[PDB]
Swiss-Prot record, chains A, B, C, D:
Protein name: Chorismate synthase
This protein's pathway: Metabolic intermediate biosynthesis; chorismate biosynthesis; chorismate from D-erythrose 4-phosphate and phosphoenolpyruvate: step 7/7
Subunit structure: Homotetramer.
UniProt-listed Enzyme Commission number(s): 4.2.3.5
Cofactor binding, per record: Reduced FMN (FMNH(2)).
CDD domains associated with the record: Chorismate_synthase
Protein residues bound to NADP(+): 40
Length: 377, 377, 377, 377
């Protein structure tokens, strides 16, 4: 049973991702992880410490370290061990952060943990942590591809007030074009609209959020279950995606728009096919009653504008109780990449749950046999 | 650490809800549970078996049984023990269900579990299970009220193509009026619009979904955490709400609309107040960076139309591979009630996580002290 | 992933066992459960509410209710709902329990939960709860037999000061003789010694504990893992067995005696065989480095004397702070039966972890294929 | 809710310990961790990557890296990324390991994971992993001391055939003398006996196991619970201790010897005292009915001889199916140190479970208040 953990402060020495429960024999390398970390940097130092040998998973815990290049600047302010308080009071960088940014973990985090300073909160809350997620996600990704022939990608639906691209989702062969787009858009018209919204926001010195859609292709029928709320795959995906920094909404398939349609036009009808049932629409986004139906999985995430707009947001100085202005510390296309990663981690877990196995070869045997059994129906 | 489990088939003898980890000394009765089960039946036999003594929780597992009144009709078809297969083949009610309904667990469930018959799938997948959830939810509810003075309610935002009510959410004092509404609407104009959509759908012999909003009031700052994706309260709520039958989307606060706003207008600014920070908007829906900020928690759920529209939905007969039509087996206002329940279960768990305690009095002491500590800031 | 929960107070209306995550298609009936509950009653009303249809598991949560026959006597004192406090003060049975028994949950439970009365503590702490465990255990048992040809049994090693039977463990064919023994002894000489110890203790009006050994036969190699402490099968078994009421020690195989042997004589040497490796000793008790090695699994549990000895044990009246004497509310052979049950639950979970599957047939395919793969080595 | 994870192969680049859920404000440093790692090396390079700032925990995940000094020798054989298979076949160090050692994870691990080589199994299974545990344990240790004034230590009861020290356990002030002993013995006579057994085994070229006892002092009443098997503190401790490499048995207090006593002499009687109940014996080892009773917690672990005895143990070459002899790759006093660590991790988790809190100060308030409440009884 797959588990993943991230660790690290934004300005700490390094980030760590640990993945536990991954079967032995999955091919994945430092380079794969770096490639995926590079994809996270798209939009307008990796060390594998354990669990992988000669590019193949060992079956034990996989620990992946991501170095922080800025560490020399932070090694006193973010030092693990005590530092002379007199030497530290002379360090401008160590100044108190007492003006919580609206929209961020600052205020609630300070109160919750009894902090006088927001620094310990933002260091961990920061979306720099998503880099560790992506390191972990790459392992799930390699597993999904090699065990199931499953591919995970994403594309941006809207940024700011752009008109949502509601056409067909991309396939895996479209990923280079998507990744090459400044807004990771699949649709050229939608692309132009989004770039325009960004240009105008940039000019106004403002910030934007957006909507992104992860797509997983090639899934077998029956991952997740209808047996309880927690086992529904959409429940698990929603947790994994909503828990991403700045995400305020999650949809499966046509999501909130489904809730505005009539039953006669809301669902995906089934028809006879050569190698099983075929559907002509995918309004469900590949999930029905908590399980994969074989159609492309579509998961959409709504990201709020996350970058603090300079001198726009009133706040309070918790030190004084006086009015203040939040001092700043779009990322929509990268959010799409992070969503891919969380979707992959969840899918990989659900796959190991149904197909079991301790090595890829074993898991592959069980998959094959389940597929043969379904075909023989 | 609070856990909840539901058990039961729709036409089985009874449903069971088990709640584990609830502190001793919470006042809750059979009548409370029945009251909340009654609320679930709003819209256009309870036996407490364990864990409660004289209307006060014991600290052990709380098992709540909900009887099925139709059991005599089903006691052979849904018999636990073997039944002579010749006697059963003469029972019309035991006929094979081999035409999976689009939008339901039928097809994927049959394939996943190797079933030839959809009966075992729909029996457990059916939203009749939400009654067991609500039994469990009532315990969390009583805890939230008595430990924290927290109230949970809901109201319907839209049904079918109605214009979404986007005005202010209701307070606890508005619940009778909401519950008295045929569509559990808070807004009279929105109400009329929704009733109209329903009337027209009824006439067309069609079905509707909708959007509902659970509201939790009185929450302390700091439930949930920013420390990882799984600990974010919005992550937990999303899992609990998305896992409800027929839910296709979840939002916190202004959700997907936040993703279409500029940073300067997207967030909730903070200002000085007498007894702490005050905000003038609640676009975040009471959650920031994974934690409660003290504002009303707003959680919205998108429900797809769930009732099968007679002779509209093409499907396949899995027995033959031939075309077929799905045979049928809005519920928006009741969905709102179920969402309340899932929100309450999650909030109660997060509260016990931060405030600990083995009895209500102990948990109340820790709450009080945390609140004093925050006030003294 | 198998989970089990028990609920119920000793004098409550009923006990409930819930088992979640069990694959569909396992044959098990009310009668099987009753048979195993009967075995628990060896030594000197079952209702299946959910998850089983026509004697075959459905794949959903399995809820099993066990009625309390004494309920009419307790329905006011252990009433779930409030009862007039004046009517209750006239009930002798509802008298305060304020003299905690040494060796029991009484004192620590009262302090922990802020109880003035030990009643809520002993009602849940009581070993009557093991009946619910055994109901749950029967499902795991049926699964182990049908999926893996695995059998679980037990026998008593010692009671009181008897000389421990250290000969060979029994096989499944020996269970009737063991069950027919007044002390569930496998060895006739050991039996006579144990009966003598009991006779002498009975005469002295005293109580005894003992040591029991669960044996699981037919296990495949490789359940559990060496990958971390929590995944070691011996870790899981130890948790499941030590958590049984009155158990103070757990051993795998030769346990504490292994720690007194030299490395040259402590382990089980391997030799070539026709259908795989064979060992001539089983000092390890079928577990090495956290995993099953194919040898009989042997798990031993040390039970303390649990029955309070009348007027022997000094205690304190918490109401007054005055000296008092504990007022009483062997069971070694039944402990053996309970240990069987906990071993079976853990083994079944570990099996589903490695072999996966959502139905027995699927799990059986994966098992077969893993076994073929091992044979082809 | 405290969680701990270890990662690393014995000859990999480094070990990683991650601790999640630890409250903010606990004072612990690199030096503390190194000190405790040094204690693990008693008997006949630490880098804190995250979660700690200026010697005080941040509340987020704490990642601790322990470097392997031998890494340059292993950086090709245990390289994470692929290495030219022709270059690797010339490396003597990379030779196949196909003769599983009796008593080790080798055989079952190879079969389970489909390995042809035991290397991936022993790399992770090796007790070198306990160093990562101890890094994690140090955090729990600091928490226990600062939140609860709790101290954890250990001493060796027996090694090989020595006569078990059954006198009183040590207190915290005795730790230097214990740590200074070659066998970490508390008792001088027992010490001499153990050294003799070792001398004789060394001379015979053989290996020994032993029994160790962890002692935790200063615990509040009521950690753990009687509410179910999994919540019993003895259940949790047993899992944590049995899961240590080479441990074959666990006891609480007088353990297996309790099972040989009569009820009248088996338990710890309670008597009136100035500041609460007092006991004159501690046969229970500080745990009753699943919870701490305030007495010293005593947990004993039986370690099998772990070092392979050269040319004594027959095995099979899995490559050929031919007879072979196991080639080798006491540690009792260090086992005691590891047991301390696992006990501390479990106690710290149980403490956070009851007392909650997100910072030490908050947890301390809740502790104080629970203690006052108990005193006022």
């Amino acid at each position: 049973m797959l588990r993943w953990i991230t660790a690290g402060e934004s300005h700490g020495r390094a980030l760590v991702a640990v993945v536990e429960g991954m079967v032995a024999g999955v091919h994945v390398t430092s380079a794969d992880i770096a490639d995926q970390l590079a994809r996270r940097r798209l939009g307008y130092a990796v060390t594998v410490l354990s669990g992988i040998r000669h590019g193949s998973t060992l079956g034990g815990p996989i620990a992946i370290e991501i170095g922080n290049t800025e560490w020399p600047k932070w090694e006193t302010v973010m030092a693990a061990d005590p530092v002379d308080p007199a030497e530290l009071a002379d360090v401008a960088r160590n100044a108190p952060l007492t003006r919580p940014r609206p929209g961020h973990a600052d205020y609630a985090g300070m109160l919750k943990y009894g902090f006088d300073d927001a620094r310990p909160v933002l260091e961990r809350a920061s979306a720099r942590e998503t880099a560790a997620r992506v390191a972990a996600g790459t392992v799930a990704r390699a597993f999904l591809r090699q065990a199931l022939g499953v591919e995970v990608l994403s594309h941006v639906i809207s940024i700011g007030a752009s008109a949502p691209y509601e056409g067909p989702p991309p396939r895996a062969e479209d990923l280079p074009a998507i990744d090459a787009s400044p807004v990771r858009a699949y649709d050229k018209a939608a692309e132009a609209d989004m770039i325009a919204q960004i240009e105008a926001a940039k000019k106004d010195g403002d910030t934007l959020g957006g909507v992104v859609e992860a797509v997983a292709l090639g899934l077998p029928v029956g991952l997740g279950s209808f047996t309880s709320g927690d086992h529904r795959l959409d429940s698990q995906l929603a947790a994994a995606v909503m828990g991403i920094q700045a995400i305020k909404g999650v949809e499966i398939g046509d999501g909130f728009q489904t809730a505005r349609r009539r039953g006669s036009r809301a669902h995906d009808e089934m028809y006879p096919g050569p190698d099983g049932v075929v559907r002509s629409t995918n309004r469900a986004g590949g999930l029905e009653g908590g399980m994969t139906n074989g159609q492309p999985l579509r998961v959409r995430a709504a990201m709020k504008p996350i970058s603090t707009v300079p001198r726009a947001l009133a706040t309070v100085d918790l030190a004084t109780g006086d009015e203040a202005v939040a001092i700043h510390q779009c990322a929509v296309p990268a959010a799409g990449v992070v969503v891919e990663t969380m979707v992959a981690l969840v899918l990989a877990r659900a796959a190991l749950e149904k197909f079991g196995g301790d090595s890829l070869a074993e898991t592959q045997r069980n998959i094959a046999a389940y597929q043969r059994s379904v075909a023989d129906r």
